[PDB]
Amino acid sequence: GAVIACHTKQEFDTHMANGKDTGKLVIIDFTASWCGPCRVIAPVFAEYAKKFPGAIFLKVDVDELKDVAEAYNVEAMPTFLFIKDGEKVDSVVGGRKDDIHTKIVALMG
């Protein structure tokens, strides 16, 4: 149960495809190194990955994958997107710890 940093669009796509194929919830943390709030939520997101080995936890640095961030209309940092069966199903804008846990548990079933 580990957070996977996706450093290329190709890396992002292969893990996204794995989640779609296996029916697992995928949670993307859209983050930046300049971002204070992102730094704060980072260890919490890492801990969720350990607690939920049944879901896939991806990290996307918005300045590294500018095209992926744009595709997801990322307009505040951090933004967490929840993907299920290929589609966005939910989001959390900001380091809202409890909200993130709640949605993981609810969406995983």
Side-chain angles (χ1 to χ4, degrees), residues 68-106:
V68 177
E70 172 60 47
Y72 286 97
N73 313 120
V74 177
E75 293 177 4
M77 295 285 90
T79 286
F80 301 89
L81 297 205
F82 299 74
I83 313 297
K84 190 62 203 284
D85 307 297
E87 294 301 314
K88 166 154 101 157
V89 298
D90 213 335
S91 73
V92 172
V93 177
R96 302 182 53 81
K97 302 181 202 315
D98 201 39
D99 283 26
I100 297 163
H101 179 263
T102 297
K103 293 177 184 297
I104 295 169
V105 165

Side-chain angles (χ1 to χ4, degrees), residues 2-41:
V3 170
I4 299 140
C6 304
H7 293 298
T8 61
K9 188 190 179 266
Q10 294 61 41
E11 193 158 35
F12 179 74
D13 292 346
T14 189
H15 293 289
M16 285 282 279
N18 178 52
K20 186 177 177 174
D21 181 59
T22 64
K24 292 183 183 178
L25 178 65
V26 179
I27 313 91
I28 320 163
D29 176 5
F30 290 101
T31 187
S33 294
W34 48 256
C35 183
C38 295
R39 277 295 95 223
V40 177
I41 201 69

